[PDB]
Amino acid sequence: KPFSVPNLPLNTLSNSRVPSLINAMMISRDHGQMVQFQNGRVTLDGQLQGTTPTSLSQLCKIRGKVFHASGGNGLNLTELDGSAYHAFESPAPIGFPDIGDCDWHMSATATNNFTGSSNEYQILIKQESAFAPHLGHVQADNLSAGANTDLIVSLSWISPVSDQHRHDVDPWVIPRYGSSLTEAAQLAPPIYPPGFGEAIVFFMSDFPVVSGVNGMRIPCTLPQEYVAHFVNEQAPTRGEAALLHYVDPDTHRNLGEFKMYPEGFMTCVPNSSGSGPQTLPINGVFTFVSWVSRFYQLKPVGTA
Amino acid sequence: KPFSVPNLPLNTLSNSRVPSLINAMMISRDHGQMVQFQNGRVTLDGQLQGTTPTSLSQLCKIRGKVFHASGGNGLNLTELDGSAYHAFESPAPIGFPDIGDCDWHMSATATNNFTGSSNEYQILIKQESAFAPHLGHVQADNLSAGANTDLIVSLSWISPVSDQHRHDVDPWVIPRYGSQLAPPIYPPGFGEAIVFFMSDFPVVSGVNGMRIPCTLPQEYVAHFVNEQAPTRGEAALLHYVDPDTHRNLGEFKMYPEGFMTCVPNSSGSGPQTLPINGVFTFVSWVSRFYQLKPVGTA
Numbered sequence: 001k002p003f004s005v006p007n008l009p010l011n012t013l014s015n016s017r018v019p020s021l022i023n024a025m026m027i028s029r030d031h032g033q034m035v036q037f038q039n040g041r042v043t044l045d046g047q048l049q050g051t052t053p054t055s056l057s058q059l060c061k062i063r064g065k066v067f068h069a070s071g072g073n074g075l076n077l078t079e080l081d082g083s084a085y086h087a088f089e090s091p092a093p094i095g096f097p098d099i100g101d102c103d104w105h106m107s108a109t110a111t112n113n114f115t116g117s118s119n120e121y122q123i124l125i126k127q128e129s130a131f132a133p134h135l136g137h138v139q140a141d142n143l144s145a146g147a148n149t150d151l152i153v154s155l156s157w158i159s160p161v162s163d164q165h166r167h168d169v170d171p172w173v174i175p176r177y178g179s180s181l182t183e184a185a186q187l188a189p190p191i192y193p194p195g196f197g198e199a200i201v202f203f204m205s206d207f208p209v210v211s212g213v214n215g216m217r218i219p220c221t222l223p224q225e226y227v228a229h230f231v232n233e234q235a236p237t238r239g240e241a242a243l244l245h246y247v248d249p250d251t252h253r254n255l256g257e258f259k260m261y262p263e264g265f266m267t268c269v270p271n272s273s274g275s276g277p278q279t280l281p282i283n284g285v286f287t288f289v290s291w292v293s294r295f296y297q298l299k300p301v302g303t304a
Numbered sequence: 305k306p307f308s309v310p311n312l313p314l315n316t317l318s319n320s321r322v323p324s325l326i327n328a329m330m331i332s333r334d335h336g337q338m339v340q341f342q343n344g345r346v347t348l349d350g351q352l353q354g355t356t357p358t359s360l361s362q363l364c365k366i367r368g369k370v371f372h373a374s375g376g377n378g379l380n381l382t383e384l385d386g387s388a389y390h391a392f393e394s395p396a397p398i399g400f401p402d403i404g405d406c407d408w409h410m411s412a413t414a415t416n417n418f419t420g421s422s423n424e425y426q427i428l429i430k431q432e433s434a435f436a437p438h439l440g441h442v443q444a445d446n447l448s449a450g451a452n453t454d455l456i457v458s459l460s461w462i463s464p465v466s467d468q469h470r471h472d473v474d475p476w477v478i479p480r481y482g483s484q485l486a487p488p489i490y491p492p493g494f495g496e497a498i499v500f501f502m503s504d505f506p507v508v509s510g511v512n513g514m515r516i517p518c519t520l521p522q523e524y525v526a527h528f529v530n531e532q533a534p535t536r537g538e539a540a541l542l543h544y545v546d547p548d549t550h551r552n553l554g555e556f557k558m559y560p561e562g563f564m565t566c567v568p569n570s571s572g573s574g575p576q577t578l579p580i581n582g583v584f585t586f587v588s589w590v591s592r593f594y595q596l597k598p599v600g601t602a
């Protein structure tokens with residue numbers, strides 16, 4: 001299989017960290033020096049990493065059996081298909097949200113004999129001591145479902161930590177999957193802008209975020225539909241970087257040069273400390289040009 | 305350019321009518337006589353039909369500005385990116401849910417200055433006279449948001465119609481958009497049955513319980529829209545293959561209109577007994593005359 005990227009306009013594709021349409025590209029010197037997102041993580045040759053699903057249907061979802069304990073109610077986690085989650089292996093079940101150091105307001109439904117609004121639960125997952133998805137359990141506040149009830153849970157909105165240790169939401173940080181007790185195993189690796197003057201390209205989507213450092217915006221490193229594409233093709237990586245053009249869909253005019261690294265993320269060079277890809281139209285298409293050296297100097301993108 | 309289907313296990317893919325993992329395949333001698341789903345509709349050469357999005361991020365969502373009326377408040381619809389929705393182009397905004405003749409229990413959030421639980425609204429959309437998706441407005445009960453508030457709404461669960469004209473939910477039926485639709489699909493003959501990819505979904509009193517049928521995995525839609533492979537025959541012959549063992553588990557024909565058929569053994573359950581972790585693989589272009597080996601138990 002020759003390497004390719006989807007011929008789909010960027011603004012028809014999803015964020016890989018929340019189920020929301022991409023509406024912007026951005027670079028961030030402050031937040032973009034190192035990222036370790038666990039969702040939207042895949043190699044150019046199709047190797048899934050972290051908690052990354054193939055399908056958006058699994059993204060920002062939790063499944064578990066309800067427990068009632070002295071310390072609070074919560075979920076003994078399963079995979080979304082109900083199959084057993086193997087603790088102390090993956091950071092969390094596949095599709096588990098990777099937005100750290102904030103409150104998750106979520107919606108849960110009974111997977112068995114759903115009768116209506118009494119089988120829908122608005123719950124709050126805090127990232128405190130009892131948040132231990134790597135050990136196979138999280139505590140949920142305002143969870144009234146009976147013990148051993150099987151629940152599928154969707155992320156509704158995120159807000160600053162209940163315990164008031166910070167007053168804003170940083171979507172650039174990932175959860176402590178093993179709580180204070182352990183670093184989680186099989187984390188997708190840290191990513192850094194590799195090349196000369198290069199900045200990691202973040203695909204931005206709007207999401208209900210209370211007091212976001214970037215407002216109601218969530219960054220990711222790859223459109224979700226790109227993940228399914230790479231997992232499908234399993235195309236061999238034949239060079240150090242894939243040179244892409246971001247092209248006008250109608251004229252095929254090259255609007256900018258980007259490098260995709262084997263680690264499954266994309267860089268650009270901004271125009272003399274400009275906003276880089278932020279000023280580009282969002283209806284464009286990425287197109288594979290050739291395999292290039294990691295040293296390949298990208299022509300600056302965007303306005304000065 | 306050679307036609308292909310995604311080399312991805314079905315159980316890792318989504319329904320194209322609800323955002324839920326595929327957990328079964330089925331045929332139906334009652335429900336599969338005619339289908340006209342508006343989501344999961346695409347040609348094998350990659351032409352989107354009905355309200356079908358490329359991305360699951362657009363599926364089963366509604367966006368609109370709140371209006372207040374004496375008959376009931378509601379939404380003047382936009383597309384999900386917030387751009388204006390025009391009638392006469394499509395049956396409804398892209399990704400508009402296509403589960404007919406039932407109550408839609410939905411969660412709306414403010415797209416501007418989201419403050420928390422006071423900008424999250426649990427609303428009810430009935431399919432009655434004030435349901436006008438084609439015109440670009442729907443009535444919503446239990447909606448307290450201010451006039452002209454921009455809301456993005458997702459489907460939470462479905463239940464029997466409020467006006468009680470029926471006491472079950474049939475997810476095989478599509479909504480009345482007005483008086484543009486992706487065309488009807490029929491079984492083409494010789495015992496060929498339309499394959500339905502089933503996903504679990506909160507459904508109160510479902511005719512098939514808590515199950516939603518579609519004709520394509522969502523990720524197949526994005527694949528065809530990407531590839532745009534010329535259709536070179538009357539049907540794409542597929543093998544449903546164990547990705548480990550590489551063993552052919554059964555034969556299927558995918559038609560240019562973007563649906564699959566199989567032939568059940570002795571009027572049995574057809575693909576229902578097959579494992580759900582298999583992958584479809586393109587074998588060749590065949591004629592309508594190609595007779596599929598029967599699949600399943602009797």
Ligand SMILES: OC[C@H]1O[C@H](O[C@H]2[C@@H](O)[C@@H](CO)O[C@@H](O[C@H]3[C@H](O)[C@@H](O)[C@H](O)O[C@@H]3CO)[C@@H]2O)[C@H](O)[C@@H](O)[C@H]1O
Pocket residue numbers: 103124159160161162164420
């Ligand atoms: O502050 C971040 C949290 O905001 C929201 O929760 C807050 C909300 O539930 C209000 C409702 O009045 O209560 C807050 O707790 C207060 C409490 O009201 C005071 O009496 C007490 O002295 O202080 C506490 C904490 O400062 C509560 O924080 C969201 O729902 C949460 O997810 C957080 O984002």
